[PDB]
Design a protein around this motif. Structure first.
Motif, PDB file in Angstrom:
ATOM      1  N   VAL C  44       1.291  -1.189   0.159  1.00  0.00           N
ATOM      2  CA  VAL C  44       0.078  -0.046   0.138  1.00  0.00           C
ATOM      3  C   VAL C  44       0.841   1.206   0.048  1.00  0.00           C
ATOM      4  O   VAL C  44       1.739   0.525   0.292  1.00  0.00           O
ATOM      5  CB  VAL C  44      -1.119  -0.285   1.205  1.00  0.00           C
ATOM      6  CG1 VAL C  44      -2.016  -0.945   1.427  1.00  0.00           C
ATOM      7  CG2 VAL C  44       0.045  -0.320   2.031  1.00  0.00           C
ATOM      8  N   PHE C  45       0.519   2.195  -0.226  1.00  0.00           N
ATOM      9  CA  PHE C  45       0.771   3.369  -0.804  1.00  0.00           C
ATOM     10  C   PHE C  45       0.116   4.714  -0.080  1.00  0.00           C
ATOM     11  O   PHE C  45      -1.062   3.958   0.762  1.00  0.00           O
ATOM     12  CB  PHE C  45       0.911   4.540  -1.800  1.00  0.00           C
ATOM     13  CG  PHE C  45       2.232   3.754  -2.972  1.00  0.00           C
ATOM     14  CD1 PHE C  45       2.898   2.733  -2.760  1.00  0.00           C
ATOM     15  CD2 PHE C  45       1.642   3.794  -3.977  1.00  0.00           C
ATOM     16  CE1 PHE C  45       3.322   1.820  -3.376  1.00  0.00           C
ATOM     17  CE2 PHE C  45       2.595   3.563  -5.411  1.00  0.00           C
ATOM     18  CZ  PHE C  45       3.249   2.098  -5.056  1.00  0.00           C
ATOM     19  N   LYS C  46       0.289   5.823   0.790  1.00  0.00           N
ATOM     20  CA  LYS C  46      -0.145   6.197   1.384  1.00  0.00           C
ATOM     21  C   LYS C  46      -0.541   8.060   0.362  1.00  0.00           C
ATOM     22  O   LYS C  46       0.245   8.515  -0.182  1.00  0.00           O
ATOM     23  CB  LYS C  46       0.133   7.417   2.575  1.00  0.00           C
ATOM     24  CG  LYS C  46      -0.570   8.157   3.197  1.00  0.00           C
ATOM     25  CD  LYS C  46      -0.302   7.722   4.580  1.00  0.00           C
ATOM     26  CE  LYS C  46       1.072   8.818   4.508  1.00  0.00           C
ATOM     27  NZ  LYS C  46       0.491  10.915   4.493  1.00  0.00           N
ATOM     28  N   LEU C  47      -2.008   8.509   0.198  1.00  0.00           N
ATOM     29  CA  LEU C  47      -2.318   9.033  -0.063  1.00  0.00           C
ATOM     30  C   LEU C  47      -2.458  10.139   0.004  1.00  0.00           C
ATOM     31  O   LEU C  47      -3.810  10.499   0.794  1.00  0.00           O
ATOM     32  CB  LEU C  47      -3.482   9.219  -1.365  1.00  0.00           C
ATOM     33  CG  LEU C  47      -4.457  10.125  -1.921  1.00  0.00           C
ATOM     34  CD1 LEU C  47      -3.445  10.563  -3.620  1.00  0.00           C
ATOM     35  CD2 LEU C  47      -5.343   9.934  -3.234  1.00  0.00           C
ATOM     36  N   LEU C  48      -1.532  11.186   0.037  1.00  0.00           N
ATOM     37  CA  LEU C  48      -1.502  13.308   0.688  1.00  0.00           C
ATOM     38  C   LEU C  48      -0.970  13.801  -0.010  1.00  0.00           C
ATOM     39  O   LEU C  48       0.334  14.273   0.094  1.00  0.00           O
ATOM     40  CB  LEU C  48      -0.537  12.194   1.673  1.00  0.00           C
ATOM     41  CG  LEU C  48      -0.444  14.053   3.231  1.00  0.00           C
ATOM     42  CD1 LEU C  48       0.112  14.656   2.599  1.00  0.00           C
ATOM     43  CD2 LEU C  48      -1.655  13.827   3.632  1.00  0.00           C
ATOM     44  N   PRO C  50      -0.339  16.198  -3.563  1.00  0.00           N
ATOM     45  CA  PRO C  50       0.730  16.377  -4.612  1.00  0.00           C
ATOM     46  C   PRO C  50       0.934  14.716  -4.653  1.00  0.00           C
ATOM     47  O   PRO C  50       1.828  14.998  -5.423  1.00  0.00           O
ATOM     48  CB  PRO C  50       0.824  17.300  -5.297  1.00  0.00           C
ATOM     49  CG  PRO C  50       1.187  17.539  -3.578  1.00  0.00           C
ATOM     50  CD  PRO C  50       0.304  17.655  -1.952  1.00  0.00           C
ATOM     51  N   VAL C  51       1.654  14.255  -3.349  1.00  0.00           N
ATOM     52  CA  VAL C  51       2.080  12.728  -2.976  1.00  0.00           C
ATOM     53  C   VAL C  51       1.849  12.097  -3.055  1.00  0.00           C
ATOM     54  O   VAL C  51       1.012  12.172  -2.099  1.00  0.00           O
ATOM     55  CB  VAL C  51       3.721  13.815  -2.501  1.00  0.00           C
ATOM     56  CG1 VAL C  51       5.122  12.678  -2.656  1.00  0.00           C
ATOM     57  CG2 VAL C  51       4.238  14.980  -2.867  1.00  0.00           C
ATOM     58  N   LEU C  52       1.804  11.292  -3.902  1.00  0.00           N
ATOM     59  CA  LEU C  52       1.918   9.806  -3.045  1.00  0.00           C
ATOM     60  C   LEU C  52       2.934   8.979  -2.780  1.00  0.00           C
ATOM     61  O   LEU C  52       4.296   8.493  -3.114  1.00  0.00           O
ATOM     62  CB  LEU C  52       0.712   8.873  -3.983  1.00  0.00           C
ATOM     63  CG  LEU C  52       0.827   7.598  -4.475  1.00  0.00           C
ATOM     64  CD1 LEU C  52      -0.341   7.092  -3.259  1.00  0.00           C
ATOM     65  CD2 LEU C  52       0.310   6.965  -5.512  1.00  0.00           C
ATOM     66  N   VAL C  53       3.172   8.685  -1.401  1.00  0.00           N
ATOM     67  CA  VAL C  53       4.509   7.973  -0.416  1.00  0.00           C
ATOM     68  C   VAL C  53       3.975   6.541   0.101  1.00  0.00           C
ATOM     69  O   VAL C  53       2.683   6.347   0.106  1.00  0.00           O
ATOM     70  CB  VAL C  53       4.043   9.185   1.302  1.00  0.00           C
ATOM     71  CG1 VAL C  53       5.055  10.399   0.724  1.00  0.00           C
ATOM     72  CG2 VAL C  53       2.821   8.802   1.446  1.00  0.00           C
ATOM     73  N   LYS C  54       5.134   5.840  -0.094  1.00  0.00           N
ATOM     74  CA  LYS C  54       4.693   4.481   0.079  1.00  0.00           C
ATOM     75  C   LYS C  54       4.666   3.963   1.590  1.00  0.00           C
ATOM     76  O   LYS C  54       5.449   5.179   2.408  1.00  0.00           O
ATOM     77  CB  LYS C  54       6.530   3.104  -0.250  1.00  0.00           C
ATOM     78  CG  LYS C  54       6.842   2.405  -0.180  1.00  0.00           C
ATOM     79  CD  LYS C  54       6.602   0.791  -1.141  1.00  0.00           C
ATOM     80  CE  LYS C  54       6.799   1.435  -2.314  1.00  0.00           C
ATOM     81  NZ  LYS C  54       8.782   1.342  -1.430  1.00  0.00           N
ATOM     82  N   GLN C  55       3.432   2.924   2.087  1.00  0.00           N
ATOM     83  CA  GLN C  55       3.080   2.499   3.543  1.00  0.00           C
ATOM     84  C   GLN C  55       4.381   1.306   3.255  1.00  0.00           C
ATOM     85  O   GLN C  55       4.304   0.346   2.427  1.00  0.00           O
ATOM     86  CB  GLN C  55       2.185   2.994   3.292  1.00  0.00           C
ATOM     87  CG  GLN C  55       1.382   4.053   4.072  1.00  0.00           C
ATOM     88  CD  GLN C  55       2.495   4.836   4.928  1.00  0.00           C
ATOM     89  OE1 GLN C  55       3.099   6.194   4.237  1.00  0.00           O
ATOM     90  NE2 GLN C  55       2.292   4.439   6.177  1.00  0.00           N
ATOM     91  N   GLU C  56       3.821   0.740   3.839  1.00  0.00           N
ATOM     92  CA  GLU C  56       3.521  -0.939   4.522  1.00  0.00           C
ATOM     93  C   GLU C  56       2.361  -1.438   5.007  1.00  0.00           C
ATOM     94  O   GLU C  56       1.493  -0.082   5.823  1.00  0.00           O
ATOM     95  CB  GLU C  56       4.191  -1.252   5.325  1.00  0.00           C
ATOM     96  CG  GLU C  56       5.983  -0.960   5.304  1.00  0.00           C
ATOM     97  CD  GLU C  56       6.046  -2.511   3.628  1.00  0.00           C
ATOM     98  OE1 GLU C  56       5.963  -2.966   3.820  1.00  0.00           O
ATOM     99  OE2 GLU C  56       7.363  -1.834   2.923  1.00  0.00           O
ATOM    100  N   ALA C  60      -0.029   0.757   7.378  1.00  0.00           N
ATOM    101  CA  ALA C  60      -1.803   0.578   7.212  1.00  0.00           C
ATOM    102  C   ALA C  60      -2.182   0.544   7.953  1.00  0.00           C
ATOM    103  O   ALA C  60      -3.696   1.993   8.207  1.00  0.00           O
ATOM    104  CB  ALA C  60      -1.804   0.010   6.048  1.00  0.00           C
ATOM    105  N   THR C  63      -2.492   3.498  10.804  1.00  0.00           N
ATOM    106  CA  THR C  63      -2.504   4.873   9.985  1.00  0.00           C
ATOM    107  C   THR C  63      -4.132   4.989   9.730  1.00  0.00           C
ATOM    108  O   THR C  63      -4.706   5.915  10.845  1.00  0.00           O
ATOM    109  CB  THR C  63      -1.814   5.161   8.478  1.00  0.00           C
ATOM    110  OG1 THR C  63      -1.118   4.656   8.590  1.00  0.00           O
ATOM    111  CG2 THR C  63      -2.215   6.641   8.058  1.00  0.00           C
TER     112      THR C  63
END
Lengths: 127, 103, 102, 104, 514, 107
Positions: C44-48, C50-56, C60, C63
């Motif tokens: 999974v990533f994180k939609l925050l 204008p930047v889409l940042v990597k997650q685990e 998640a 979060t």
């Protein structure tokens, strides 16, 4: 009797329309859930490689090439990235379709309750 | 009796509101036909023109996009006059049937 | 009397952002249904913005678990905010109505 | 009939419209600024950093990812200074329209 | 609150005294006029036995019941309602004395019954089968009008009365539901009253002399708008969308010229020429530029017609209502034989007579447009209801007291039910009959005792029904005077008196309830 | 009592109003799916043709897109039968029951 009922039947008319508008909003929410599944049906079947015109922004389309049809983004949560496959994506769409139906189903007899009570006031003023 | 006259005039006014939604719905589209046909003629038409609406792109040329633009603009301005005449003729018809009934 | 509507507007403004949370509350429960199926099948990533940042996936789960908890924190204050503004204004509907009469 | 109170009614309404424009630009300023700090803190340059421009994406450094947001904060703040330079100009007429009711 | 043994009977009979006393001078030509300003707080001139009851703000429960009882009499007779008031308090007077002597009211009520049917036996004996000739109809119509109004006004009206009821014999109708339209003419003298066989239209077609003399009238009684109201709406009334309201305007002016062109096709459809006329009665106003153009085509077009005239013109003449003027045959329309525009006052009053069917005859009174015009309105109304009974029966009787002493001679002297229990109620019954001849003559100056001894002897001498001359005070024979009552009228006043006398007599408690 | 059986057929009337509006959509979706099939069967110049449900438009040859668009009018053709049979059924349910209501209340 009658001056109370003439005020009473006018109040229930707004309460029908306020709930029925909320029904009209949630159908739009489940509309894109039907729409996202039907976009996904073409995706796995066609192949990778085909050219698509997607919105770069509003009313502006960018071309591109298609790859990795079996891995899609699902936008759930508070606006969060969830990567799924395309197969589990169809199940979660139809789950959200029945969910938005369930959101309207709890309104639906109460929507009809505000309509039938208003008609009964129209009858009690008539009787 | 004067009740058949004053209530029949209420019937013709309600058809003026029934006339109201249909003609203005088309009337908002002809101005969109106005703004589109002018930008196409000013811009380059040698490259091929397509027709993009919601849900379908058919790969076309400029010579097939251009006549339907002038066609669909002219069809709208005829119907908004046509929808006016029909509903106003309907208001004339219900008044004489109310006067011949309850006499 | 302006004091009648003022306590209502301060209550109704808090309710509108609270009703925003409840659709988020359900979809915070939707994503926990979807994060439970993932164990390494899809990251999974994180939609925050204008930047889409990597997650685990464990990243998640915490979060959306926090954002589930922040909603419930704003629910309980409104229950204090509901009963206070309805009781203060109810006292005001008797006294401030007599001010305009005499 | 008074034309100075016609200027006095226009003056107070211009006071109201300016202060509301400052508040909406301050919230956009902090929104971009706090969007900078959160994405830097999580996962700097490891293999690539995708950045959203519509629906297509660019992969580059973490500090350049802030840099697009840094520029819009610079453009927005210069407006806020220029907005308050108009908030100040709408106050000087307010002190002077009181005398002009007595003058003309 | 309750009313006990003596008081519950006493309030009923004492109220019947002063009700009879105030309503004394209201029957016959001795009957004086009355005004109410305490019934509605307005200047009102009113005379009838029933109508005076309905206007006065009465709170005694007996007079409220009599207003209900005499209503059933007023539906058939009219006058005679003031005849019923006089005999009730007199009937209650004699029986109360027996109760003042100490007697059951029911044994007198038992004596009220067999006394009545002997008088009812006497009504078949005293009925005089006359013809329903016009002069015989005049004498009924003379005494009916002179009861309510002057005799000089009566005889002018009596000319107009007796001819319309001969017109309803053409329809073979014994009763009067139509030919009873009272139309009122703007005048200053109510000395004049015109009789029109057909109808009277009350308007005059703004551009006059379109066609004021129509020998062949094909009538169209419609209400077509030619001054059409033009509205722009988006909400059922005026709305804020200026874009939406503009498009309805172009069709609004097309409606007025539409109804002008439809008149032209109808004139050639019905008439074909200008020798045969065509009359348009519009319930609304007509365009004067249309009234100029219709006048040249051979059309008179009357405007702003009364909605009450709209149905009655369809009944006698004909003509149905439309909102168009489409091509119609003369079968769909009615006919009038003669149309003439008459003028008196600030309005033109078009006369329309000799209908397709002369079924309704319009009684056009003139007057100063006062309550005097109202006072002559209900006077001729009760004038028509009295002679309505004349076409009903075959026996027109000399009234005014001629039957009254003639009953009481047979009742007192001959015990019908010689057992003494019922003859007590006979004595109250026969003494109830005396009140009508004795006190109106006593009002005239010759007191009640000189009148009674004269008419009792003379009728027992002659057998000819000597009545009472209400203008001298002495008995004169009503067969030659022309103060007559019908066989239909005199039964009901005997009927309506007795039933309403017995039930209020047979009470003992009047309790507040509800 | 008799009040309850009145409200049942009145609640059946609004179900007909829902049944009346569903056939107006499904008749439109058949003809519009037929209308878009005509415009692509109009051209013979280019086999290039884009289909999509969202704002995506995939590149495919037109001939396979025809037969899918033949199926698009057909499913909307299939549903107008089952709705109109349903719409008549709900019409027959309320109107024949309405014959029971008014004539025996006015009796």
């Amino acid at each position: 009797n009658l001056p109370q009922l003439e005020m009473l039947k006018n109040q229930l008319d707004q309460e029908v329309e306020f709930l029925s508008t909320s029904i009209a909003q949630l159908k739009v929410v489940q509309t894109k859930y039907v729409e996202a599944k039907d976009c996904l049906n073409v995706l796995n079947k066609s192949n990778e490689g085909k050219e698509l015109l997607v919105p770069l922004t509003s009313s502006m389309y960018v071309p591109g090439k298609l790859h990795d049809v079996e891995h899609v983004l699902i936008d759930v949560g508070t606006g969060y990235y969830v990567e799924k496959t395309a197969e589990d994506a169809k199940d979660f769409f139809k789950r959200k379709i029945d969910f938005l139906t369930k959101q309207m189903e709890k309104i639906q007899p109460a929507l009809q309750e505000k309509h039938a009570m208003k008609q009964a006031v129209m009858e009690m003023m008539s009787q | 009796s004067a009740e058949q006259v004053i209530a029949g005039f209420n019937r013709l006014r309600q058809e003026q509101r029934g006339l109201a939604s249909k003609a203005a719905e088309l009337e908002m589209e002809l101005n969109e036909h106005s703004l589109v046909i002018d930008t196409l003629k000013e811009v380059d038409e040698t490259r091929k023109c397509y027709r993009m609406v919601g849900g379908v792109l058919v790969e076309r040329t400029v010579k097939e996009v251009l006549p339907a633009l002038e066609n669909n603009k002219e069809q709208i301005q005829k119907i908004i006059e046509t929808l006016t005449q029909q509903l106003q003729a309907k208001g004339k018809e219900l008044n004489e049937f109310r006067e011949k009934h309850n006499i | 009397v302006e004091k009648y509507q003022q306590l209502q507007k301060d209550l109704s403004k808090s309710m509108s952002g609270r009703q925003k949370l409840e659709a988020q509350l359900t979809e915070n429960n939707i994503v926990k249904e979807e994060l439970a199926l993932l164990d390494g099948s899809n990251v999974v990533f994180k939609l925050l913005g204008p930047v889409l940042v990597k997650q685990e996936l464990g990243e998640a789960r915490a979060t959306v678990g926090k954002r589930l908890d922040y909603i419930t924190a704003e629910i309980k204050r409104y229950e204090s905010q509901l009963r206070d503004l309805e009781r203060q204004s109810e006292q005001q509907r008797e006294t401030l109505a007599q001010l305009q009469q005499e | 009939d008074q034309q100075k109170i016609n200027k006095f009614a226009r003056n107070t309404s211009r006071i109201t419209e300016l202060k509301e424009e400052i508040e909406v630009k301050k919230k956009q300023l902090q929104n971009l600024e706090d969007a900078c700090d959160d994405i830097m803190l999580a996962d700097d340059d490891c293999l690539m950093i995708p950045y959203q421009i519509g629906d297509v994406f660019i992969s580059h450094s973490q500090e350049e990812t802030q840099e697009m947001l840094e520029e819009a904060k610079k453009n927005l703040q210069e407006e806020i200074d220029a907005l308050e330079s108009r908030v100040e100009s709408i106050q000087r007429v307010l002190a002077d329209l009181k005398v002009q009711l007595y003058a003309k | 609150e309750v009313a006990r043994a003596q008081a519950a009977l006493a309030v009923n009979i004492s109220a019947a005294r002063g009700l009879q006393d105030v309503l004394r001078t209201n029957l016959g030509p001795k009957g004086t006029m009355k005004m109410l300003v305490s019934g509605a707080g307005d200047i009102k001139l009113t005379k009838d036995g029933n109508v005076l009851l309905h206007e006065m703000q009465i709170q005694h429960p007996t007079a409220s019941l009599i207003a209900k009882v005499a209503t059933a009499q007023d539906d058939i007779t009219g006058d005679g309602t003031t005849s019923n008031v006089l005999i009730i308090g007199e009937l209650l007077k004699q029986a109360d004395l027996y109760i003042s002597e100490g007697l059951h009211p029911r044994i007198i009520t038992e004596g009220f019954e067999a006394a009545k049917e002997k008088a009812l036996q006497f009504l078949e004996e005293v009925k005089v089968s006359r013809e329903m000739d016009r002069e015989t109809l005049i004498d009924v119509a003379r005494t009916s009008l002179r009861t309510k109004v002057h005799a000089e006004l009566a005889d002018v009206l009596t000319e107009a009365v007796v001819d319309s009821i001969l017109a309803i014999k053409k329809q073979d109708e014994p009763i009067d539901l139509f030919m009873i339209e009272i139309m009122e003419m703007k005048h200053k003298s109510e000395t004049d009253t015109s009789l029109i066989r057909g109808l009277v239209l009350d308007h005059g077609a703004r551009h006059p002399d379109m066609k004021k003399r129509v020998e062949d009238a094909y009538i169209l009684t419609c209400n077509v708008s030619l001054e059409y109201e033009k509205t722009e709406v988006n909400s059922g009334f005026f709305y804020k969308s200026a874009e939406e309201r503009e498009k309805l305007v172009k069709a609004e002016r097309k409606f007025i010229e539409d109804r002008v062109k439809k008149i032209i096709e109808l004139k050639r459809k019905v008439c074909g020429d200008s020798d045969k006329g065509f009359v348009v009665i519009n319930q609304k106003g007509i365009d004067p530029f249309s009234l100029d153009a219709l006048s040249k085509e051979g059309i008179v077009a009357l405007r702003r017609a009364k909605r009450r005239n709209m149905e009655r013109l369809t009944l006698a003449c004909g003509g149905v209502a439309l909102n168009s003027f489409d091509d119609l045959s003369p079968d769909c329309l009615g006919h009038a034989g003669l149309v003439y525009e008459y003028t008196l006052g600030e309005e033109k009053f078009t006369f329309i007579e000799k209908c397709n069917n002369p079924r309704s005859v319009t009684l056009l009174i003139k007057g100063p447009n006062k309550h005097t015009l109202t006072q002559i309105k209900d006077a001729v109304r009760d004038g028509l209801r009295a002679v309505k009974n004349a076409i009903d029966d075959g026996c027109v009787v000399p009234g005014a007291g001629a039957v009254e002493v003639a009953m009481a001679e047979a009742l007192i002297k001959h015990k019908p039910s010689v057992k003494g229990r019922a003859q007590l109620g006979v004595q109250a019954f026969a003494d109830a009959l005396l009140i009508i001849p004795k006190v109106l003559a006593q009002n005239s100056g010759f007191d009640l005792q000189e009148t009674l001894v004269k008419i009792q002897a003379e009728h027992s001498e002659s057998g000819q029904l000597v009545g009472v001359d209400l203008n001298t005070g002495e008995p004169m024979v009503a067969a030659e005077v022309g103060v007559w009552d019908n066989y239909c009228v005199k039964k009901q006043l005997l009927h309506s008196c007795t039933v309403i006398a017995t039930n209020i007599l047979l009470v003992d408690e009047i309790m507040r309830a509800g | 009592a008799f009040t309850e059986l009145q409200a049942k057929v009145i609640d059946t009337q609004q179900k007909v109003k829902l049944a009346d509006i569903q056939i107006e959509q499904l008749n439109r979706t058949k003809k519009h799916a037929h209308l878009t099939d005509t415009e692509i069967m109009t051209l013979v110049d280019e086999t290039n043709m884009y289909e999509g449900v969202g704002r995506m438009f995939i590149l495919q040859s037109k001939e396979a897109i025809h037969s899918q668009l033949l199926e698009k009018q057909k499913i909307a053709e299939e549903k107008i039968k089952e709705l109109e049979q349903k719409k008549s059924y709900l019409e027959r349910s309320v109107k024949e029951a309405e014959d029971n209501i008014r004539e025996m209340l006015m009796a």
